[PDB]
Each structure stands twice: as C-alpha cells, then as structure tokens.
Design a protein around this ligand. Structure first.
Ligand SMILES: [Mg+2]
Lengths: 228, 234
C-alpha cells in the first residue's frame, strides 16, 4: 500500500446535535515519495452528504495535493439533521488513481450499541458471512433480516432492499413486502443477491429500508459489497 | 446500440397523499444478432429513498432472471407502483435499467413529483433554489476536466431567510468529494444569493458517474432540499 489512512473523539450525539473532533492520519509506507489529494466527508440518513469543512464566508478554494501527516479537523452536526447513523470518511486519492478510505461511525439521537429501531420494533440486518467483495466473474452474498416487534401491539411494516451501484444502477434485491407483525413475534428471512458476471465493477451499497406504515417513520441500513 | 430502452409514465404529478404510477417499458433489440440481458424498474426519491417497482404479497424469493430478444424483435411490458403518503414530497426518478450479457448498461428515466408543482423550481416555502450545470457539460475526459455550476437562491418571502448551503460530488469507489464547503447566508426579502462554483475532476479521480449534490437548508424551519446533477468521468 502506497498510503495508509481516522478516529473520532466521540461516537454518540443527542438529537440536539453537537461537535465531533476527528484525528486524521495519512502514512506513506512505500519506497518512493507519493502525491495525493485528501478530504473529510460525511454521509448521513435521509440522503445527507456533507463536507467536514465549514467556512464563515464564501468557499473559493479547490482540492490541493499534498506530498509525503497528522491533522485534526472538527465539525458541527446541527439539530436539524436527521437522527440515525452517520459515517465520517477520510478519503485519499493518490496520483496513480488508487483510492484509500478510513471510515468511522457516529450516531445522532439513537443509542450506539443498540439495534436500529422504530419505537420498539427492532431491525437487525446483516451481511451474513461478512463477504465484502465478489469476483468480476460473479458471486452471491446472503443477508440476514430479523424484524423483532417488542411493542405491546401489532406493527404494520413495509420492507425492501436495493443495490445502489456503478453506472447509476439501482438493482432490486428484495421486492417491497408488507407484514403485520404481532406483539412479540419476529419477521425473519435470509435474502441474497447474485452479482452476475455482467454487472459493472465497483462499489454497491446494499440498502435495506424498513417503514412503520402507521407512524410513517423509515429507517435504513446500508452495507457495502465491492465487485472487483 | 445492442439495446434501446424506453419508458413512459401514465402521469407525472402526485399529491402529498401519494398515488399510483403506471409505467410502459419498451426494450428493443436493434442489433444483427440475438441479445441476452437482465432488466428491472427502480425508483429514486428525496431523502435518500430508493425502492424497487416490484411489490409482492408474500416473501420475495426470486432472483433477477435474463430475457432474450431475437434480431429486430422487441419487448413491451407494463408495470405499476404505489407511492405512499409517508414518502417525502419532492422529485422522483423512475429508471428502467438493462444490463446486457456483455456488461453494457442501458437506462431510460422519467420524472414524477409528489406534493409539489411539476415545472416549478425546488423551494423552501418561498425561497426558490435554482442550481444548474452552467454550460451543460455532462462528461469530462479521463485526463481531467472542470465543470462550473450556477447557484441562485432567490428569497421570495416577506422576511429574511437564514440558509445553509453545501455541495459534494458522490462518485465511484465510495468517494464523497467536497465541492462547496458549508456556508451560511442571511438573504433579505427580495434578494438573491448568486454564485458560480466549479469542480475540477483531477486525472487521478476514478472513471464513472458522479452526482453533484447540492443541499440547501432553512436553518429556522430546519427543512432541507436537494438538487442532484450528473457528470460522467470517462
Ligand atoms: Mg396526477
């Protein structure tokens, strides 16, 4: 690796938001000097994406290279942004096109170390065997889905999954299903996606959504699989 | 082109209570030889929503199956979907997507709106948001290129608007490239915040599709609106 790339001072914010301070480390392990560009960005719920940089005036700058690093950057997460899971991403693009990323999570207005949930309905969706990539010639990745209703009454849920990938692909992974889950019951399945040989190389976000139809609240779970 | 894809929607405007959209899908094999492909219909919406057109009464157990079209022959199917009241008001894109056996991707897209006017600017309660690819540059070379965007935030309200604004490029390999840092503006009644802002796609950046994504927030109401535009790096 020509580059090795993050830690956050805290990983839990309340719904009123707060400040996250991040320590960025970029090491040049290789024999030669390396030129790269780097930045810090955030991905959140409800399609939020934002740069860690905030400015008091007009942003006039462009992405400058460095050459080889230890810097600290902090950002505010305002109350208005959605409650849920955020990913902070230090990203480095080396002159030769190799991309390096270091990611860490924080949560806003939900418990770290508890499952995602819709008011007692708990959502446990996982890459079953931790398969983070498949070959260009194709591969299959199964995902476990457990929707456990911890409420006193029955929960009316809707559930689907897509693979959001290269070339603007949005591949159906699970069609939209609707379930009435009794108090104390669980909806469980294993669902896989076959990445056909024909599908483009690159990064796919397996994106599960669960909706409580009565409250209208929606929660996402995103998992990444790379097709080489 | 080994495939030509066509899509049309029976209507392009829904109320906030939602409704049903019926879509006509056309896939034509123009080429000399028989072609094998897979295809599907998906929707992208506000607030990070993505969903498949298909809904099932039980447990979805099926996988994406291939179809085949002989020389000159075509496929015509009609598919519909419900857009429930709970999904966000704003702009939606319906996408018919075809992946041919050889890896070539073909797409036909159409827009509909929910709870907003078709043919009006995105807005936050009288604050209008007009963000555009300035010269209609939809792609840049692998060796690099620069694309400028115009930003016009016109405050049509009686009072001043307190806005926050930023832009990223969401691209291949999970890149989220800063394009405009987070700025805050106080725009007086009747004024416009205008700027031109560009992104340099350096040679080093990966080939593929970049969504230039602008977000505008009314800091007082806490309402947020996006505008997305696509640039392909070859
Ligand atoms: Mg209508």
């Amino acid at each position: 690796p020509v580059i090795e790339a993050l830690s956050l001072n805290q990983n839990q914010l309340a719904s009123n938001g707060g400040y996250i301070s991040s320590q960025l480390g970029i090491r040049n392990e290789s024999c030669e000097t390396v030129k790269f560009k780097y930045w810090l960005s955030i991905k959140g719920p409800e399609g939020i994406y934002f740069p860690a940089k905030a400015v008091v005036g007009v942003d006039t700058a462009q992405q400058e290279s460095d050459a080889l690093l230890n810097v600290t950057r902090g950002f505010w997460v305002p109350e208005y942004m959605a409650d849920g899971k955020y990913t902070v991403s230090l990203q480095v693009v080396a002159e030769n096109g190799k991309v390096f990323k270091a990611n860490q999570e924080f949560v806003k207005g939900v418990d770290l170390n508890s499952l995602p949930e819709l008011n007692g309905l708990t959502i446990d969706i996982k890459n079953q065997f931790g398969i983070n990539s498949v070959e260009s010639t194709g591969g299959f990745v199964p995902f476990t889905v457990d929707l456990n209703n911890g409420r006193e009454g029955e929960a009316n849920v809707e559930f689907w999954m897509t693979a959001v990938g290269p070339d603007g692909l949005i591949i159906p992974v699970n069609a939209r299903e609707k379930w009435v889950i009794a108090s104390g019951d669980t909806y469980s399945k294993v669902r896989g996606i076959n990445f056909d040989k024909s599908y483009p190389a690159g990064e796919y976000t397996i994106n599960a959504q669960v909706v409580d139809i009565v409250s209208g609240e929606r929660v996402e779970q995103s998992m990444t699989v790379v097709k080489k």
